[PDB]
Amino acid sequence: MREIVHIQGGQCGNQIGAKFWEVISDEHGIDPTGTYHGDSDLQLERINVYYNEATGGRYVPRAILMDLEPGTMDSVRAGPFGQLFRPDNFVFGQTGAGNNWAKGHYTEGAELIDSVLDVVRKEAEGCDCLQGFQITHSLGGGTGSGMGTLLISKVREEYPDRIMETFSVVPSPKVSDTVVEPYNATLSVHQLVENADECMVIDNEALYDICFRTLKLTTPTYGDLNHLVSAAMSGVTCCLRFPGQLNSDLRKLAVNLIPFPRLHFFMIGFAPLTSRGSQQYRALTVPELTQQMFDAKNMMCAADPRHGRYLTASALFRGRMSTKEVDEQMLNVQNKNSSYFVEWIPNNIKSSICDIPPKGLKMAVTFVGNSTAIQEMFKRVAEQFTAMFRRKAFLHWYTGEGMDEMEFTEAESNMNDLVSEYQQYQDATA
Amino acid sequence: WYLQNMNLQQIPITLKKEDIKRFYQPVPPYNGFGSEADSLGSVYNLQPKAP
Numbered sequence: 001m002r003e004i005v006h007i008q009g010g011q012c013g014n015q016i017g018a019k020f021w022e023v024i025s026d027e028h029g030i031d032p033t034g035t036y037h038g039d040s041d042l043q044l045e046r047i048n049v050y051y052n053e054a055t056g057g058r059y060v061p062r063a064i065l066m067d068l069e070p071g072t073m074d075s076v077r078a079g080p081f082g083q084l085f086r087p088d089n090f091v092f093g094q095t096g097a098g099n100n101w102a103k104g105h106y107t108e109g110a111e112l113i114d115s116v117l118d119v120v121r122k123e124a125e126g127c128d129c130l131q132g133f134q135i136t137h138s139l140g141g142g143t144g145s146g147m148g149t150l151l152i153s154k155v156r157e158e159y160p161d162r163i164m165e166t167f168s169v170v171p172s173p174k175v176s177d178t179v180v181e182p183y184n185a186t187l188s189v190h191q192l193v194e195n196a197d198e199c200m201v202i203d204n205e206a207l208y209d210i211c212f213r214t215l216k217l218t219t220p221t222y223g224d225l226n227h228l229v230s231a232a233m234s235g236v237t238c239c240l241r242f243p244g245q246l247n248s249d250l251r252k253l254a255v256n257l258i259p260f261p262r263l264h265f266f267m268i269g270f271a272p273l274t275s276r277g278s279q280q281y282r283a284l285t286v287p288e289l290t291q292q293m294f295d296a297k298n299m300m301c302a303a304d305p306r307h308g309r310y311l312t313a314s315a316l317f318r319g320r321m322s323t324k325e326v327d328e329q330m331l332n333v334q335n336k337n338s339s340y341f342v343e344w345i346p347n348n349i350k351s352s353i354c355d356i357p358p359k360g361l362k363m364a365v366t367f368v369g370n371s372t373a374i375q376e377m378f379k380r381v382a383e384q385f386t387a388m389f390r391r392k393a394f395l396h397w398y399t400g401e402g403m404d405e406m407e408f409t410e411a412e413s414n415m416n417d418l419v420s421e422y423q424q425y426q427d428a429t430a
Numbered sequence: 431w432y433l434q435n436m437n438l439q440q441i442p443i444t445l446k447k448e449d450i451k452r453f454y455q456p457v458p459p460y461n462g463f464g465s466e467a468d469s470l471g472s473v474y475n476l477q478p479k480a481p
């Protein structure tokens with residue numbers, strides 16, 4: 001019941017899903033040939049959330065993989081647990097978008113999206129009770145930033161009542177692997193703010209910073225970043241698949257975390273995480289979990305959360321623990337940091353507890369925080385956009401394929417208005 | 431002197447020596463982050479160096 005399907009596009013989406021499904025598979029105890037070998041009975045009661053049953057007793061993810069080039073999918077076919085994907089869901093182009101939003105959103109993406117829309121419609125009709133959709137992309141690639149957001153728009157046009165989650169990797173200037181990052185980022189955000197029910201940003205700079213200082217490991221890798229992202233992803237939906245004292249579905253999170261419909265951009269955090277050296281040295285307690293939770297450095301984003309005030313916060317605990325301790329710790333933190341919490345809405349922290357901890361850990365914590373400190377990323381992205389747009393740089397490709405600079409002006413105006421109206425509530429007083 | 435004069439060889443006697451006790455500290459189990467070689471640096475030394 002209340003199951004969701006996974007849809008991933010582009011190299012980043014495919015590789016993120018590659019280990020998200022690996023983490024889910026390890027949590028549910030499924031073998032790479034589709035044969036269940038778990039130990040607990042609770043591992044099978046809610047397996048229908050992410051797995052469909054097939055003849056012979058095997059399970060298949062409801063995952064749809066799309067790209068305008070087939071190399072990334074032919075490579076993810078090689079990774080561990082890559083033999084679980086249903087081959088028909090692989091949809092690939094023959095040309096590639098070349099990091100061009102126009103190519104990925106107007107000519108080639110519009111023509112290609114027909115088959116993937118057909119299969120997505122088939123998957124959505126097949127399920128017993130649809131809960132929503134989760135879509136993972138990065139804003140640094142043209143094919144992703146165009147095709148993913150166009151599919152978000154198309155899916156929203158057909159399912160207005162369902163919920164939509166977007167896992168957005170925004171390009172920050174510190175980890176700048178492309179010069180056309182802000183054109184595509186602004187053009188993707190302009191469409192995303194209109195249609196995405198929820199969006200949560202992830203920064204590779206933050207990932208690497210976490211890897212060097214928190215885990216203190218010398219050689220961070222794409223695998224480590226993907227593993228952290230996948231753990232954070234599973235922390236949100238663990239409570240929907242496992243019993244707990246206070247269940248809270250994604251719809252309840254949407255109700256309790258979004259005050260105004262256009263303010264649905266989040267930053268997250270996962271606890272506990274420590275080096276191998278301090279694993280035995282440390283002790284797992286609720287105060288330690290919450291102090292590592294609410295540390296400004298622990299955030300999954302490069303934005304500084306002490307530069308603004310939290311609009312709302314959501315907590316998902318995993319493991320068997322007393323609720324009174326959790327409530328008193330949250331009350332203590334909210335009293336001790338009253339300067340960093342908005343005052344006209346009292347009790348802006350939501351709590352959820354699940355009795356099933358992750359495999360290998362006794363206690364776990366997922367934080368999702370909607371705060372005004374996220375304005376810095378948008379401000380710097382808009383600054384880079386206006387710098388590169390003032391001299392009409394690299395716009396010949398975009399203007400030669402059907403779209404003009406009026407759309408750029410509208411996107412910049414909308415993004416600036418979004419930033420202004422997001423910071424407006426920061427200075428609001430009762 | 432005891433060998434020739436007393437026709438008696440003297441056999442020296444050994445002694446029990448001091449044995450110090452030493453404690454063993456086991457390597458913590460793999461949590462699931464990073465890699466073995468990179469992650470073991472933290473427990474091996476305070477300042478981690480590339481494996």
Ligand SMILES: Nc1nc2c(ncn2[C@@H]2O[C@H](COP(=O)(O)OP(=O)(O)O)[C@@H](O)[C@H]2O)c(=O)[nH]1
Binds near residue numbers: 009143145177
């Ligand atoms: N977590 C993670 N992020 C990645 C990896 N490779 C690239 N990225 C991020 O993805 C963004 C680039 O996406 P891109 O490959 O151009 O997307 P595409 O055009 O759809 O294939 C950059 O901001 C990178 O930081 C990876 O292996 N792991």
